[PDB]
Amino acid sequence: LELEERLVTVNRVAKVVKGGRRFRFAALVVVGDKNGHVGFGTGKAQEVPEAIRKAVEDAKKNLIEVPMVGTTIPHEIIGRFGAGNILLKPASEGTGVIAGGPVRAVLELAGVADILSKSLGSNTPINMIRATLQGLSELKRAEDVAKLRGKSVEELLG
Amino acid sequence: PTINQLIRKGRVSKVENSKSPALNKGYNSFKKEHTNVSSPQKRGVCTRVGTMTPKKPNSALRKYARVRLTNGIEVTAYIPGIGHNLQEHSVVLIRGGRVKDLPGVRYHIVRGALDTAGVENRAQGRSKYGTKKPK
Amino acid sequence: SERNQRKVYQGRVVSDKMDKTITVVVETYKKHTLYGKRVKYSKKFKAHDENNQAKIGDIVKIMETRPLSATKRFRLVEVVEEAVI
Amino acid sequence: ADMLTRIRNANMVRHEKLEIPASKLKREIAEILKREGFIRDVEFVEDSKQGIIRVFLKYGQNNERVITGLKRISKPGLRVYAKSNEVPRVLNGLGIAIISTSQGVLTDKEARAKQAGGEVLA
RNA sequence: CGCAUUAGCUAGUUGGUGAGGUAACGGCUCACCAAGGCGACGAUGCGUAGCCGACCUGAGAGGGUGAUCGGCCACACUGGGA
RNA sequence: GGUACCUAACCAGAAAGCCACGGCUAACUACGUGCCAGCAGCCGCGGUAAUACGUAGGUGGCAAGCGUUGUCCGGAAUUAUUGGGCGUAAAGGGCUCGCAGGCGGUUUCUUAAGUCUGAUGUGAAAGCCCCCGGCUCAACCGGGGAGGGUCAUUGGAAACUGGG
RNA sequence: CGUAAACGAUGAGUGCUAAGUGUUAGGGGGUUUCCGCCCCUUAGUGCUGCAGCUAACGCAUUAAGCACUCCGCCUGGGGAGU
RNA sequence: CCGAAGGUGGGACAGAUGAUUGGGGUGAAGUCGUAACAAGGUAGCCGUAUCGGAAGGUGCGGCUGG
RNA sequence: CCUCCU
Ligand SMILES: [Mg+2]
Ligand SMILES: [Mg+2]
Ligand SMILES: [Mg+2]
Ligand SMILES: [Mg+2]
Ligand SMILES: [Mg+2]
Ligand SMILES: [Mg+2]
Ligand SMILES: [Mg+2]
Ligand SMILES: [Mg+2]
Ligand SMILES: [Mg+2]
Ligand SMILES: [Mg+2]
Ligand SMILES: [Mg+2]
Ligand SMILES: [Mg+2]
Numbered sequence A: 001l002e003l004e005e006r007l008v009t010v011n012r013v014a015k016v017v018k019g020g021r022r023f024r025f026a027a028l029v030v031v032g033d034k035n036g037h038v039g040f041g042t043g044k045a046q047e048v049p050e051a052i053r054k055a056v057e058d059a060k061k062n063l064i065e066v067p068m069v070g071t072t073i074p075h076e077i078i079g080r081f082g083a084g085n086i087l088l089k090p091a092s093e094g095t096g097v098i099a100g101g102p103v104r105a106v107l108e109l110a111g112v113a114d115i116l117s118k119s120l121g122s123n124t125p126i127n128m129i130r131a132t133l134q135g136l137s138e139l140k141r142a143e144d145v146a147k148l149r150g151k152s153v154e155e156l157l158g
Numbered sequence B: 001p002t003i004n005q006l007i008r009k010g011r012v013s014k015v016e017n018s019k020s021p022a023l024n025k026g027y028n029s030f031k032k033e034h035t036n037v038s039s040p041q042k043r044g045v046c047t048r049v050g051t052m053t054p055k056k057p058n059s060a061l062r063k064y065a066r067v068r069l070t071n072g073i074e075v076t077a078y079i080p081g082i083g084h085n086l087q088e089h090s091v092v093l094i095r096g097g098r099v100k101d102l103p104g105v106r107y108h109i110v111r112g113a114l115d116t117a118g119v120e121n122r123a124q125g126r127s128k129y130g131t132k133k134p135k
Numbered sequence C: 001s002e003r004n005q006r007k008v009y010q011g012r013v014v015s016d017k018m019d020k021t022i023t024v025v026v027e028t029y030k031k032h033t034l035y036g037k038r039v040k041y042s043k044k045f046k047a048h049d050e051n052n053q054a055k056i057g058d059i060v061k062i063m064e065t066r067p068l069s070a071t072k073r074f075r076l077v078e079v080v081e082e083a084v085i
Numbered sequence D: 001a002d003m004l005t006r007i008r009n010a011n012m013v014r015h016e017k018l019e020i021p022a023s024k025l026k027r028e029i030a031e032i033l034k035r036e037g038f039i040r041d042v043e044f045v046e047d048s049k050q051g052i053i054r055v056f057l058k059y060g061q062n063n064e065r066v067i068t069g070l071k072r073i074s075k076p077g078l079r080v081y082a083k084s085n086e087v088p089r090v091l092n093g094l095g096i097a098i099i100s101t102s103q104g105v106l107t108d109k110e111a112r113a114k115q116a117g118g119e120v121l122a
Numbered sequence E: 001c002g003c004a005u006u007a008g009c010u011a012g013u014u015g016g017u018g019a020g021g022u023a024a025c026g027g028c029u030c031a032c033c034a035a036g037g038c039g040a041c042g043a044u045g046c047g048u049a050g051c052c053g054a055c056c057u058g059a060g061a062g063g064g065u066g067a068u069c070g071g072c073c074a075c076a077c078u079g080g081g082a
Numbered sequence F: 001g002g003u004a005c006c007u008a009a010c011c012a013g014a015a016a017g018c019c020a021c022g023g024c025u026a027a028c029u030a031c032g033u034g035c036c037a038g039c040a041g042c043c044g045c046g047g048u049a050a051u052a053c054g055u056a057g058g059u060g061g062c063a064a065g066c067g068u069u070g071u072c073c074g075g076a077a078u079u080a081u082u083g084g085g086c087g088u089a090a091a092g093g094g095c096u097c098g099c100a101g102g103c104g105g106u107u108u109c110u111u112a113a114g115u116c117u118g119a120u121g122u123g124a125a126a127g128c129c130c131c132c133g134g135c136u137c138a139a140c141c142g143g144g145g146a147g148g149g150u151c152a153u154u155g156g157a158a159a160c161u162g163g164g
Numbered sequence G: 001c002g003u004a005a006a007c008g009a010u011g012a013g014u015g016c017u018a019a020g021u022g023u024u025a026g027g028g029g030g031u032u033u034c035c036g037c038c039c040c041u042u043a044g045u046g047c048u049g050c051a052g053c054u055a056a057c058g059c060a061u062u063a064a065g066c067a068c069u070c071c072g073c074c075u076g077g078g079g080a081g082u
Numbered sequence H: 001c002c003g004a005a006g007g008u009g010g011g012a013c014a015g016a017u018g019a020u021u022g023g024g025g026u027g028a029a030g031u032c033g034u035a036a037c038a039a040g041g042u043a044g045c046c047g048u049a050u051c052g053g054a055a056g057g058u059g060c061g062g063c064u065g066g
Numbered sequence I: 001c002c003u004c005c006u
Helices: A048-061 A102-110 A126-138 A143-149 A153-157 B003-008 D003-012 D024-034
Strands: A004-016 A021-032 A077-081 A084-090 A115-119 B042-052 B062-069 B074-078 B091-094 C008-015 C022-031 C038-048 C059-064 C074-078
Touching (some): A077 A126, A143 A153, B042 B074, B074 B091
Antiparallel strands (some): A077 A084, B062 B074
């Protein structure tokens, strides 16, 4: 796959020793196809390349795919991780990616172009948005649900 | 709360307080009553002009007026601007901004209601200190 | 005669002592505006019973009339149910 | 009289079957659920109690269910009565709402057609 | 609409009968009878307020406002009467 | 009111502005001060090299104004019905007995208040808005709709809630 | 008098959702004459630990899990339990 | 006859103000001690009582958030 | 026992 990477944040963190404060940088990087695949990234409290390496692993480990009915997700979903709570709500065409900051990064590199998204708790909350995008894959498009249920696609939808 | 509880006792909003209470009370001479009126400025008479030390971590002599307004409430208000704008016991107009350093000073004296200076030859937005633009 | 009827109500007789008169209590279940629960509302009324037939428990129907006193506004059209004790 | 929690709890731990005290509407819910493909059969026994037979819902006949991740929520004692017009759809399709009617249930089309929204599930 | 750090209120008060008055129904007024009526679903009291079309804001639920313009109401130096 | 508008010269002459430029939010350097003088929506600047102060030269928005103060809604899923909580962050009543209230197992029959549903009447005009047209488009005016009701009246349905 | 860190800092009721191991008072059933051992089981009382939950610590059939009913309480710190 | 205004009276309620007085808040560099945080040098804290310039001390019961 | 202010 052909990944694009986006830098969410770089916070200087610190450990204290007898000498004083010893500083490292923890980078957080989203990576994705712009076509259904996107990765978390951690940054190993050191640099951005370290973040990219872990991001590109997490794209294929965690979000095996981001389900996409057209230019939007199949259904409305609430992604929760810890005190992360994202509402991801499917939009009409030409709506845009209406989302805040770290959430936008995920949904842009996932290739989602039309979505409404409210954050209900905030602090690099990509894990929560990741859990929802996986929760869509629990009931992606309609092929699985119909196959899971024992139905047709047009039977299920209408 | 249970729905039954919410019916029995509703929700109650937080009462938000104004940051400038003195500009909210009007007055009537006849009834001798404060009235609820949303004023942007209040005229007053300076009862005391002097200086005061700011709180930590700052040090200064911050020039201020104890002012007696038209509504009859006595406030403290900051004399803004570089150079001696302190003035003496005299009529003045007041504004609604706190001086973070000075505890109790919740109002500025508006520069331009009378003889003022402020910062002369201001770089931009030359309208905050009563700085009449020269030609 | 093609007459449009006045607003008609039905309820239990809570008061009766007032001669030529009753209190009919139209209990009902109005939804609370915000929370949407059916709350047990009860509107008292003041209707007229000339004969003094009605008593405690009677689920009578009453119809609007001319103001038959200060408070009275209805007549006892019929005693539908006749509760006893 | 909450089969939903009984289902959720067993569904969480991937149980094969569960025995839920039978009632007419709990019977009529299990069949609505069975429309997908849960329950194979039950065992009606000599009635001592009115529900001892249970519902015997068996959604996990094999090791893993093809129909897994069953989820319900909208069941409060505060009554929620749907308009035939404004019947909701769970997840915009991919989920059903057991809308109790005088004569009908299920989809949005089965509201303006059938009528009484009544109960509303998810 | 707010306040229970306002819990009891009412005595033409509540109903009757009669008489009078009113364009008009009626404790509307009075006579004579009873003893009622209201209230924890908040009476009563205190505070605040003209109400509404609307207006501002908001995804919406809601929240706030009710100058200008239209409708209903009330008032016309203060108070009473025809 | 010899006022709008036209012609025609003198002719683009008469018609550019204010505010902002740490970050939020796209936008820096001299000098003079030296915890002074002053600044400040928030975090915070100044104690003798101040990209946030005094001055001096320098730049993104909207467009004769824009700064400042005041009020309201938003952001604030921050009174949470939608849509929050209570072991340790604020929050379980010290514990009972209980009146009212709230809530209530299964079947069946019947009822039909709630629930649902059809039909009919009104909810002015303006405004905002659906198609939207006209006035050169507009900063504006017309018609036909729609919303508008915990609303009547009446006829059904009867699973669920309520009554027998 | 009416308060305590009156504490499990955990309201009451009901159902549902792996196991393992003590212990208190019972019950049933094994081959056995009992004792004893073993199996099962009810109601307590502890410890460990699944799933799930949690900001984390931890909770975990004696839930802080999944649900429903009802009650009590919270809404930045001070000022002030004044 | 009713009757506005007025008069008289004793109460109710609300605001302003008052010698003096009470704590409270705030305030770069005041005085006294050192109560708490470590076993904080007597584990701390809760209720109550009492005593003491002041933090606090001591009794009784309770809690572990020793 | 105490350890000025920024
Ligand atoms: Mg008024
Ligand atoms: Mg809000
Ligand atoms: Mg604490
Ligand atoms: Mg606490
Ligand atoms: Mg307790
Ligand atoms: Mg206590
Ligand atoms: Mg104890
Ligand atoms: Mg407690
Ligand atoms: Mg009890
Ligand atoms: Mg000490
Ligand atoms: Mg000690
Ligand atoms: Mg002593």
